[PDB]
Structure 1
Amino acid sequence: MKCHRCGSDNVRKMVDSPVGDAWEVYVCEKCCYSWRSTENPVVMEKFKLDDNKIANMGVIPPIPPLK
């Protein structure tokens, strides 16, 4: 199983449905993308990610110096 947003295989199960075997939730852990086992997601090509885009992503808010 791969991640639908960045294509990494470092994806694991996050949680089970609290009631029964309804569904599961998976998380990427390389880009934090989560999705439910029921919904089959198709991330638009504009919203996909690689290691290069995550690098120059920009932080909010900025991290201050340490003193």
Structure 2
Amino acid sequence: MKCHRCGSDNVRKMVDSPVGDAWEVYVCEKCCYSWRSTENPVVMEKFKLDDNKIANM
């Protein structure tokens, strides 16, 4: 599993769904992007991040 915004492999599971086994929340340690297991995030080309772009911030 890789980050949908910066492509990093450093993805950590944030939390499990408090009730039941419905979903999980994943977060990238490199760029702070988070998303849910049940959603299919497609990041717009203009919103993707790169090391060259994070360095500029």
TM-score by length of structure 2 reads: 0.98
Q: Identity of aligned pairs, percent? A: 100
Structure 2 counterpart SS, 1:40: coil
What do the CA deviations read for 1:6-65 (whole angstroms, capped 9, x no partner)? 0000001000000000100000010000000000100000000001100111xxxxxxxx
Structure 1 counterpart SS, 2:53: helix
Computing the radius of gyration over CA atoms, which structure comes out larger, 1 or 2?
1
The CA RMSD measured in Å over matched residues stands at 0.4
TM-score by length of structure 1 reads: 0.83
Moved over 3 A (4+): none
Q: For structure 1, which runs of at least 5 residues remain unmatched after alignment?
A: 58-67
Which position in structure 1 is the counterpart of 2:22?
22
Q: For structure 2, which runs of at least 5 residues remain unmatched after alignment?
A: none
* Structure-2 separation of matches of 1:36 and 1:17: 10
* Structure-2 separation of matches of 1:9 and 1:33: 12
Structure 1 counterpart SS, 2:39: coil
